[PDB]
């Protein structure tokens, strides 16, 4: 007495209308369970990390997998169009394998960090690593470096590149979010903010007209370059959110969200409201996600041990329908979604950028 | 049009510079 269970907002959604199955009997061989999902920008080679840490690339048409022998887990995976896998390992190094073989080719090291969050820009050939106090920008072929962004004191929390264009946004613990001339090491855009946030991350759109910030406090910030400041506003989150662990952009005006209340959300940034809400049984739980943008093919790792097995594009049907039936009555989306209202300057991450 | 912004603008900076310089 008392908390929430079970799986009605997650396994019931995820497995609603599948055409194949991750037959987890073939994957969960550890004495233990799957804990994290890391994934392919080229979408298909998504991968599982279990409590051993061996990366299993699940190939969702074969119901076969690439068993990567080293047990070192990834923070995230990057793949390129030519068949290579760059693994940002939790060991402080980024390790590239032929994706096609799981065969080690090279390691990027310079970082001293627990986290090496990655993002790959397929139109720049550039991969960025967010780690400790620095951003390392490098040629995606991964055998050299371009720049090491850094600071005298504000510690680094995050940043990312823009996949269908190019601009680099980074932020500090200060919440200060700023934009770099990633190829001149110039801060061209600068902010000073009120909301300090530990372990914040910046989600960067492929066409980076839009940006999002998460972190240890229960807030979400949203940028829109068509307006000044780029970060125009901030807002508080649906009741029960305590912090935000992970935020990532998708094709439509949308982001996946993981909070530290372990509820996952899909947010529509055109309004800054939540479209989808995801919940699992008590620990057990939901631990991480992988969204593949064309259909939002999804690899979810749950603490419940289940490896999913769903497309957000298909789950949206339930909040397309439902909502559209209610639209025949005239239900308001700002309530359905819970729009998060722009607040004061007192806790904003407002940022001018050009 | 933006060329008219250049028109002082930057036109006097180079002379705004100059006095004082040798005096120092």
């Amino acid at each position: 007495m008392n908390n929430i269970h079970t799986s009605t907002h997650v396994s019931t959604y995820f497995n609603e209308a599948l055409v194949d199955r991750i037959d987890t009997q073939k994957y969960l061989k550890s004495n233990g369970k799957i804990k994290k999902v890391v994934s392919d920008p080229d979408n298909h080679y998504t991968a599982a990390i279990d409590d051993s840490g061996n990366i299993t690339v699940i190939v969702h048409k074969l119901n076969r997998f690439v068993s990567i022998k080293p047990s070192s887990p990834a923070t995230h995976l990057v793949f390129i169009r030519n068949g290579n896998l760059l693994v940002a390992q939790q060991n402080g190094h980024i390790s590239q394998y032929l994706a096609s073989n799981g065969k080690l080719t090279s390691v990027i090291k310079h970082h001293n960090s627990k986290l090496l969050a990655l993002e790959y820009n397929p139109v720049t050939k550039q991969i960025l690593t967010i780690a400790n106090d620095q951003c390392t920008l490098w040629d995606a072929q991964s055998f050299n470096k371009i720049k090491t962004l850094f600071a005298k004191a504000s510690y680094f929390a995050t940043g990312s590149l823009t996949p269908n264009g190019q601009s680099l946004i980074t932020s500090f613990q200060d919440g200060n979010v700023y934009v770099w001339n990633l190829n001149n090491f110039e801060v061209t855009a600068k902010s000073e903010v009120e909301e300090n946030m530990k372990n914040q991350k910046i989600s960067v759109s492929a066409d980076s007209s839009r940006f999002v910030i998460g972190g240890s406090t229960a807030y979400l910030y949203y940028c829109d370059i068509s307006h000044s400041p780029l970060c125009i506003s901030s807002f508080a989150l649906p009741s029960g959110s305590t912090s935000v662990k992970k935020i990532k952009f998708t094709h439509g005006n949308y982001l996946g969200i993981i909070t530290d209340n372990q509820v996952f959300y899909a947010i529509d940034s055109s309004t800054n409201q939540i479209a989808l809400e995801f919940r699992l049984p008590k620990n057990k739980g939901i631990t991480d996600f992988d969204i593949n943008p064309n259909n939002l093919e999804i690899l979810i790792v749950s603490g419940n041990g289940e490896i999913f097995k769903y497309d957000l594009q298909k789950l949206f049907i339930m909040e397309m329908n439902q909502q559209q039936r209610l639209l025949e009555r005239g239900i308001e989306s700002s309530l359905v979604y819970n729009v998060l209202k722009p607040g004061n300057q007192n806790h904003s991450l407002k940022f001018e950028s050009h | 049009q933006p060329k008219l912004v250049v028109n002082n603008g930057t036109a006097t900076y180079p002379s705004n510079f100059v006095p004082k310089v040798e005096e120092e």
């Binding site: 908390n3 620990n283 419940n304 | -």
Partner: protein, 300 residues
């Protein structure tokens, strides 16, 4: 509409302290005060699994929401995480220095809370070393441990006769209430369905209910003249099952604001009233030894 003792766990050797359930409806976990816990099902031809370990007493055994992993907390200094359901496949995961009290797990699964004895509670992020999230806002003990939904808080009882809540992503005390008049070692503290309204009783024969931060009393929920009381609440937040070291069982109706009536009981010094995770339930523990499996039919 009968307390419905059905078929007890015939064979419990002595000395029973708790139970929990596998919501298949059902497999029942129970535990003794010495070296053993049991798990069995109906379709009565089924035989219980004898869980050997916890050489000291076991105070509370609980199931994950799907009825799989059974966490068993006793005078262990660890929590034994037993296999799912039945047949040994277990591990020993270190806790503190003594008895571990009642557990709860976070809803979307970040944590597996237990009231381990270093006075902090171990929130347990599934499995790890280090510590996963913990905090002591209590002066001298942790007697309960409930993770609330849509909140950052966990509540617990104590030996300082206070009740405390703290921030579970960030390990910090938020609020306390206190001696309402707890006498001694406080029993388990339970919550309203929303994880609000802390509910507790103890050596003092009365359940009192207060909120969190708004640490204010709603009612005097008089209980048993027991050495000490125990409790579970029917999940709809409708019934306070009053258990305790006395051998009466009495149930409170929260809509009526009263003890409904005492039960015939027939010697039941119920230590737990942990309910089936959804629906008609138990009142077990005590001198009768056999696990008292009830399907209370009042319960819908």
């Amino acid at each position: 509409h009968d307390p419905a003792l059905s078929r007890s766990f015939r064979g419990h050797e002595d000395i029973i302290t708790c139970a929990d359930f596998d919501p298949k409806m059902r497999q029942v976990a129970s535990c003794s005060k010495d070296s053993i816990v049991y798990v069995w099902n109906f379709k009565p031809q089924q035989r219980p699994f004898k869980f050997v370990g916890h050489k000291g007493a076991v105070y509370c055994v609980k199931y994950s929401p799907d009825g799989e992993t059974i966490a068993s907390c006793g005078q262990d200094r660890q929590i034994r995480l037993w296999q799912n359901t039945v047949q040994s496949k277990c591990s020993i995961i270190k806790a503190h220095c003594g008895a571990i009290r009642s557990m709860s797990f976070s809803a979307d699964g970040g944590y597996l809370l237990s009231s381990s004895d270093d006075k902090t509670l171990k929130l347990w992020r599934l499995q790890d070393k280090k510590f996963m999230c913990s905090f002591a806002g209590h002066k001298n003990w942790v007697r309960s441990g409930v993770i609330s939904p849509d909140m950052r808080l966990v509540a617990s009882g104590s030996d300082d006769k206070t009740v405390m809540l703290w921030d579970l992503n960030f390990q910090k005390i938020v609020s306390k209430y206190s001696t309402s008049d707890h006498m001694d070692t406080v029993s388990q503290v339970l919550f309203h369905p929303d994880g609000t309204c802390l509910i507790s009783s103890s050596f003092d024969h009365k359940i009192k209910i207060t909120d969190i931060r708004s640490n204010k009393l709603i009612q005097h929920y008089n209980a048993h003249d027991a050495q000490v009381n125990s409790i579970s609440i029917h999940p709809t937040g409708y019934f306070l099952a009053s258990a305790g070291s006395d051998s009466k069982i009495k149930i409170w109706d929260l809509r009526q604001g009263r003890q409904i009536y005492t039960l015939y009981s027939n010697d039941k010094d119920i230590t737990t009233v942990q309910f089936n995770q959804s629906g008609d339930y138990f009142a077990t523990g005590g001198s009768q030894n056999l696990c008292m499996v009830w399907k209370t039919n009042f319960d819908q």
